[PDB]
DNA sequence: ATCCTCCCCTAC
DNA sequence: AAGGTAGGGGAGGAT
């Protein structure tokens, strides 16, 4: 009677049904089957004139339909927008019907289900039993969801079951191939509803000698020949391949809540199912709760195209076709969409996710002892590391040395781990769980019992990493939060982008406000100008910079201007100044500012000189309410973030509020998207015009402000640049700072919605006090209505390179001068994914040295330029001849896709040839590594004719041949330009290139 | 299904003939191309973003040397002095040799469609523009003949040449003597450049022109009146012979100057200049010679008169008077003139009345400030004087006070006319 | 038309000279796996597994590739039905006949048409299923698929998901079309018009077209 | 030289 | 089923 919703899913048979999976307070699972309908919205005069009677129909109220097409006029004789009001019906029909005058046909049928019956996807309910008919054991049918789910109750917690799985396949030299290679190991982590956790690995005994198999049993292993004698509480079981696959079948056919794998939808499950089919007559069969459909396990590929002029394909995913309510969840696709890495391999993700700072507790001849706790790092990192340590095998030190774990002791709060490593003369090191140094190919060549047991240990770890990442990213929390806000089923939360996920709240708003938006014309795309970006005034500041940033500027612009397709009064254009002045003289009288806002936009057509968009702010439209909805959610998750304690809690809540940031901004993108239902050229262009004025207003009043004895003087009169108001616009305002303070403010940079204001100070504690008081005066006297800013941070030793490139040491707005700053980089080569690690290491060294000696200042002759260049040339020449650096430092990352024009693009060719000549296939959404490799006999040259001909795609098994070398000419040139671009000299810098590379640089 | 076969068959149909496609047919073609490519991953044909209308396939180099004619039946039509235009069915008219926007009346567009509705075998209609008079010259068709098309054109208000039909029964050596005989046999009163003849069975037109190359001395340049403030230039030689000029651009591109020798083709009836080989010098010399009070408006010259109410009534097709009130009394009575006043803005109505060219007049307006009271102009001044370097812009400004007088008057007519 | 000997039934393979470059590998690959497959009954009979190697390649222009040599009521080669009763062959004839104008006919077989060589990726399957021996043949199928492709201009494969990555399997580039199998659910093959597209692309690139109506039996 | 185009990725 | 512009750096090319 009391259930919590877990999932929704549909059948694929002739009769489509919608199923709910939910669990009761006591742990029992119940399914409810709902009839599926197609929903159509028609007007009264259409409803009464439908020749084929509808299956069912109910009135949905009296609604207003607004035609939201946009036309330009050359005068002020603007007519009222076409609007009609009529009683309308919502009709449901089991089969598709063609209705000549149906509207609101851009919403999903599942969305109509949820909204019409007032059902939230993840709600907790107390159901009225008289509407439920028992059809099977644990399955009911519900004909009246409107009254069955009327009662909602507070949320309660339920148990859930998990299956985490991984396999290891045999190979001799290359990627495994299903037609030859047997399965070696299978590992599971089995978690029941009781919470009992079982860990076990199965070993393929067919690759061991009979004497070795008996030795395994003597050591404590179990040997089984059939399935009826299997026991899941034993850590190691030896059996033949037939048993291995039948066990995999038995487990996968169970009604788990989640079955979680990492890239198992293309490899793990595919291998298991394909090999089972040949060896025996069994197949993996999924069945619906009511046993009216049964399907064999099949993997389907979903191709995602782009929306450019040559769209092509940009991503691909694989899905399991189960119909039993289980969610098959793949970490690979989830993480690839969420995070940014050089690569998304399991070792790379773990290396970054599971790490901490550990202290050296003891030292030895070949062993070091590392101790970690909350006293040496951020709270919770030592505990997360300790948790993973339970099953881990190797620990990486300072992201470079792979060390074997010899001893592990898990402490009440931290850990003590003993690693086999050379003595490292320091006290603090970074520990993480990353790459292993094992060689599987050699381990198969010499495969024996001792290897089989070590591989079983590795395999269960890989299966456990899926659980550790599951919790680390808070996947369970994100799933339910998404389903509730987007009105989507829990199974579909992470598959759709903005165009679809916003349909849930959008339908609610349209039905609540009694509005339908329709079009009668053809859309045409026109360009428009974006936000303002300032040019940096100085390269090096050597001063503290106060950064002030508008809080979600876009949503406030639409609310301020009431910008939406249905609120536009009109667009008035002129071709000549005489008409422009006449239209302005009438405009200021026809549409008084107290009710209307006028936005002066750039020309739309090349034969126009002026365009004004007129918006009516007296009635709030639909987009402002959609934006308010997302603002409310983001604020709620930001508030919870402020209350988080552990590093895990903070990461999860920070990620969710970021997600709401993006969807709120994408509402604009949909308004500017030529194929959107919300497309509005006038509104999108007007939004950015208001934004540009808003940034210039704040920048102008701060540039030249001065802090005096007890009063702040703003540079310019604080006059609202949109309309006249009753605010006191006097630029002299009272502050609460001490008389000791005397400072001048200058604007040195600015980007999209933030202003970089330099203060003539070296201290941070004074900078924080002034910045906080300065924000108070700005929000209370300078800005108006809902426009507010926050003080972000103090940037110390800020250096500017371009309009999108800078580096600084960040002091947070809540951190005093005694704190440790964070070193942050925007747009620099130290953050890019397409350069190298060789470049990054050197540019950091030289840029730091340049800043330190230039900030101090000597300049006896040409010290700064010559000192950097001389050291650079020495290191570049030394590396070329030494050739000792690992290839891993010269690897670039690139994405593969088909989004191209002409078909002869070298990028598609390079990958296509790789795929043809290798068992490894690069798919259209994957990232791969490549390098510039040339024959070892090629000397250092100066004249570079071809670059792309040196690109090769490298797999994990790639080894640089004795007849090859790294094409240093391209790696060194790129680094040299980045360093030289930081120098103020020309004569010596040009000479550097002429002797080293044989070229002349460009000095920007 | 049939839906896919329709898309594929329509794509093949348009592909075979993309040279008779307008913007809508081209968009349909390119949409079907994108549909095919995305549906099947490979398509035989690609999108088209070129192919302009051309009639060059039907003509050849003009023959100016004697030649033999063996075939019998020919039809001969004249080619008149003047600019050549081509008209397409259901479309506007385009000036041959350069794609532009030229002022075309409604009477000719209607008459063109009326004859082109007779049959679907006509590719285009050829027209010649002579002193703001339109004559139809040709209408190439795969099914019709150049006889009934012209007869219908005449009934619809268009001018047509004198149809001649000639059959050759011998081996004739075509020379200037026969050219003169057959040219005068048309009994036409308009200057002609050449004669175009066609053979029954072919669409190709062949053109003959017998002329002599010479030099002549220009004594003066003058403009003749052909309409209401519309003047056309001509070139007068020392002997008094009038050399025909196509338009204002003709003299500028031919680099014609006064009191010098220019290249000219001499014909048996008149002399003609040709365009085959600075602009600031030549246009200034022409203006100074014909008169300081003339300026260029498109292809012709106009004067800078002090036109007032008497000329406003002529443009509005109402009674000629000097009373402002009558500018609303009659308008409310005649529905054929009220439409013009209410449909167009005051800016264009007063711009037309003084014969100002659109492009240069707007350029002046956008470099000068206005002060308006109750949407009526009370003052103005120039803020950017660089626009005055073009002689047309300075001349237009010199008489801008007349524009303001009419502009303000029409503004009050609109306020009371509604 | 030479032959080789093998270690298991049918103990001999007869092939056209055009298949010589793969025969050196087919004997090794089949001898290592036949011991498992030939214990039971198969459809087709093992005696026809290699019957498709009798077809010449140098005189072909198009290859139509199915999934298996239709086990049930099979003949040993794909796209044949001795009584014109199979759904696949009837629907192929139906689409072509509607486009061509053929009304009165008694059967259809793609093995009749000149210029096209019928083929199937997997050399055998179980009776009642498809792709049941993919683990068994894959390596052999890749050898034969790239070899036959090198001799034709246009490769027409059936199965939107089955030959999704065929471009990686093939060595030489070929004009590749992947369509619906003429027996799929939801009537998705009824809108497939690959056969006409093949001939149009051949004409554009100055190649001999396929006379698809040649396959009708009168 | 010398600018133009295309692409890849980043900042908002 | 598919959010929007501003901008830098690099490789190749048509001059
Ligand atoms: N994905 C994004 C992010 C940025 N912008 C625009 O850039 C502006 C400001 O950038 P940003 O600071 O990243 O967004 P804010 O809304 O200001 O976020 P915050 O809460 O930090 O103020 C936003 O109005 C928007 C955008 O259109 N799409
Ligand atoms: Mg902001
Ligand atoms: Mg912020
Ligand atoms: Mg910002």
Short mmCIF file of C-alpha atoms in Angstrom, two decimals, chain A residues 687-867:
data_model
loop_
_atom_site.label_atom_id
_atom_site.label_comp_id
_atom_site.label_asym_id
_atom_site.label_seq_id
_atom_site.Cartn_x
_atom_site.Cartn_y
_atom_site.Cartn_z
CA UNK A 687 19.17 39.75 -24.27
CA UNK A 688 22.80 40.13 -25.30
CA UNK A 689 22.31 43.86 -25.99
CA UNK A 690 21.05 44.39 -22.44
CA UNK A 691 23.95 42.30 -21.15
CA UNK A 692 26.53 44.46 -22.92
CA UNK A 693 24.99 47.63 -21.45
CA UNK A 694 24.92 46.05 -17.97
CA UNK A 695 28.63 45.21 -18.08
CA UNK A 696 29.60 48.64 -19.42
CA UNK A 697 27.56 50.35 -16.69
CA UNK A 698 29.35 48.55 -13.86
CA UNK A 699 32.77 48.79 -15.50
CA UNK A 700 32.39 52.53 -16.11
CA UNK A 701 31.46 53.48 -12.54
CA UNK A 702 34.36 51.46 -11.07
CA UNK A 703 37.05 52.65 -13.51
CA UNK A 704 38.40 55.71 -11.71
CA UNK A 705 36.63 55.26 -8.38
CA UNK A 706 38.42 56.54 -5.30
CA UNK A 707 38.16 55.65 -1.62
CA UNK A 708 38.59 58.73 0.57
CA UNK A 709 38.47 59.40 4.33
CA UNK A 710 35.04 57.92 4.98
CA UNK A 711 33.34 58.14 1.60
CA UNK A 712 33.56 56.24 -1.69
CA UNK A 713 33.46 58.25 -4.92
CA UNK A 714 32.32 56.40 -8.04
CA UNK A 715 33.85 57.37 -11.37
CA UNK A 716 30.53 58.18 -13.04
CA UNK A 717 27.03 59.22 -12.03
CA UNK A 718 25.03 56.14 -11.04
CA UNK A 719 22.35 56.68 -13.67
CA UNK A 720 20.17 53.75 -14.79
CA UNK A 721 20.94 53.37 -18.51
CA UNK A 722 17.62 51.74 -19.39
CA UNK A 723 14.93 53.94 -17.85
CA UNK A 724 14.51 56.79 -15.41
CA UNK A 725 13.94 55.87 -11.76
CA UNK A 726 13.72 57.49 -8.33
CA UNK A 727 17.08 56.17 -7.11
CA UNK A 728 19.59 58.56 -5.57
CA UNK A 729 22.19 58.65 -8.33
CA UNK A 730 24.73 60.77 -6.45
CA UNK A 731 28.14 59.08 -6.88
CA UNK A 732 29.31 59.88 -3.31
CA UNK A 733 28.40 57.03 -0.96
CA UNK A 734 29.19 56.35 2.69
CA UNK A 735 31.35 53.34 3.56
CA UNK A 736 32.39 51.66 6.82
CA UNK A 737 36.14 51.46 6.15
CA UNK A 738 38.74 53.17 8.38
CA UNK A 739 40.15 56.60 7.53
CA UNK A 740 43.60 54.99 7.19
CA UNK A 741 42.54 53.60 3.81
CA UNK A 742 43.27 55.64 0.68
CA UNK A 743 43.05 53.74 -2.60
CA UNK A 744 42.32 54.26 -6.29
CA UNK A 745 40.57 51.71 -8.49
CA UNK A 746 41.36 50.98 -12.13
CA UNK A 747 39.70 48.64 -14.63
CA UNK A 748 42.34 46.50 -16.34
CA UNK A 749 40.31 43.63 -17.82
CA UNK A 750 36.79 42.31 -18.27
CA UNK A 751 35.05 39.26 -19.75
CA UNK A 752 31.39 38.56 -20.59
CA UNK A 753 29.99 39.20 -17.11
CA UNK A 754 32.92 40.03 -14.79
CA UNK A 755 35.06 43.10 -14.17
CA UNK A 756 38.72 42.86 -13.12
CA UNK A 757 39.43 45.93 -10.97
CA UNK A 758 43.00 46.55 -9.86
CA UNK A 759 43.67 48.05 -6.42
CA UNK A 760 46.96 49.76 -5.55
CA UNK A 761 47.80 47.34 -2.75
CA UNK A 762 50.16 44.44 -2.10
CA UNK A 763 48.48 42.96 0.98
CA UNK A 764 45.62 40.48 0.82
CA UNK A 765 43.96 41.10 4.21
CA UNK A 766 43.30 44.73 3.29
CA UNK A 767 42.12 43.64 -0.16
CA UNK A 768 39.53 41.28 1.32
CA UNK A 769 38.13 43.85 3.76
CA UNK A 770 37.73 46.51 1.06
CA UNK A 771 36.33 44.09 -1.53
CA UNK A 772 33.59 42.92 0.82
CA UNK A 773 32.52 46.46 1.70
CA UNK A 774 32.77 47.51 -1.96
CA UNK A 775 30.34 44.77 -2.98
CA UNK A 776 27.86 45.99 -0.37
CA UNK A 777 27.80 49.52 -1.81
CA UNK A 778 27.60 48.26 -5.41
CA UNK A 779 24.64 45.97 -4.77
CA UNK A 780 22.77 48.60 -2.73
CA UNK A 781 23.49 51.78 -4.71
CA UNK A 782 25.05 50.99 -8.10
CA UNK A 783 22.90 48.08 -9.33
CA UNK A 784 19.12 47.83 -9.56
CA UNK A 785 16.26 45.32 -9.35
CA UNK A 786 17.55 41.73 -9.50
CA UNK A 787 21.09 42.40 -10.77
CA UNK A 788 23.60 41.39 -8.09
CA UNK A 789 27.30 40.60 -8.02
CA UNK A 790 29.57 38.61 -5.74
CA UNK A 791 33.25 39.06 -4.92
CA UNK A 792 35.00 35.97 -6.26
CA UNK A 793 38.66 36.14 -5.25
CA UNK A 794 41.88 38.13 -5.21
CA UNK A 795 44.18 37.29 -8.11
CA UNK A 796 47.78 37.84 -7.04
CA UNK A 797 50.61 38.13 -9.57
CA UNK A 798 48.08 38.07 -12.39
CA UNK A 799 49.68 37.90 -15.84
CA UNK A 800 47.61 38.42 -19.00
CA UNK A 801 48.51 36.90 -22.37
CA UNK A 802 45.38 37.47 -24.48
CA UNK A 803 41.62 37.90 -24.19
CA UNK A 804 41.24 34.28 -23.05
CA UNK A 805 44.64 33.47 -21.49
CA UNK A 806 45.94 34.31 -18.03
CA UNK A 807 47.59 32.84 -14.93
CA UNK A 808 47.45 33.82 -11.27
CA UNK A 809 47.55 32.68 -7.64
CA UNK A 810 43.99 32.57 -6.30
CA UNK A 811 43.12 33.72 -2.79
CA UNK A 812 39.49 32.87 -2.07
CA UNK A 813 37.16 35.58 -0.76
CA UNK A 814 37.02 33.73 2.59
CA UNK A 815 40.77 33.09 2.87
CA UNK A 816 43.10 35.46 4.71
CA UNK A 817 46.77 36.18 4.01
CA UNK A 818 47.92 33.15 6.05
CA UNK A 819 46.22 30.63 3.73
CA UNK A 820 47.84 28.64 0.94
CA UNK A 821 46.77 29.93 -2.50
CA UNK A 822 45.68 27.77 -5.39
CA UNK A 823 47.63 28.09 -8.64
CA UNK A 824 45.10 28.43 -11.47
CA UNK A 825 45.53 28.70 -15.24
CA UNK A 826 43.03 29.81 -17.88
CA UNK A 827 43.75 29.30 -21.56
CA UNK A 828 47.43 28.47 -21.09
CA UNK A 829 49.36 25.53 -22.53
CA UNK A 830 49.47 23.98 -19.03
CA UNK A 831 45.76 23.09 -19.25
CA UNK A 832 45.33 21.97 -22.87
CA UNK A 833 44.63 18.36 -23.85
CA UNK A 834 46.29 18.62 -27.27
CA UNK A 835 49.88 19.65 -26.58
CA UNK A 836 52.09 17.36 -24.46
CA UNK A 837 53.59 16.89 -21.02
CA UNK A 838 57.09 17.82 -22.23
CA UNK A 839 55.76 21.27 -23.19
CA UNK A 840 53.80 21.70 -19.95
CA UNK A 841 56.71 20.88 -17.64
CA UNK A 842 59.07 23.34 -19.30
CA UNK A 843 56.66 26.24 -19.82
CA UNK A 844 55.82 26.11 -16.10
CA UNK A 845 59.50 26.34 -15.19
CA UNK A 846 60.36 29.19 -17.56
CA UNK A 847 57.19 31.22 -16.98
CA UNK A 848 57.67 31.03 -13.20
CA UNK A 849 61.31 32.09 -13.51
CA UNK A 850 60.32 34.93 -15.85
CA UNK A 851 57.70 36.24 -13.43
CA UNK A 852 60.01 36.11 -10.42
CA UNK A 853 62.94 37.95 -12.01
CA UNK A 854 60.82 40.43 -14.01
CA UNK A 855 58.63 41.32 -11.02
CA UNK A 856 61.70 42.12 -8.93
CA UNK A 857 63.36 43.94 -11.83
CA UNK A 858 67.03 44.25 -12.79
CA UNK A 859 67.32 45.11 -16.52
CA UNK A 860 70.99 46.07 -16.53
CA UNK A 861 71.06 45.40 -20.29
CA UNK A 862 68.92 42.56 -21.73
CA UNK A 863 68.96 40.14 -18.79
CA UNK A 864 65.36 38.91 -18.83
CA UNK A 865 65.29 37.99 -22.53
CA UNK A 866 68.77 36.51 -22.83
CA UNK A 867 68.68 34.45 -19.62
#
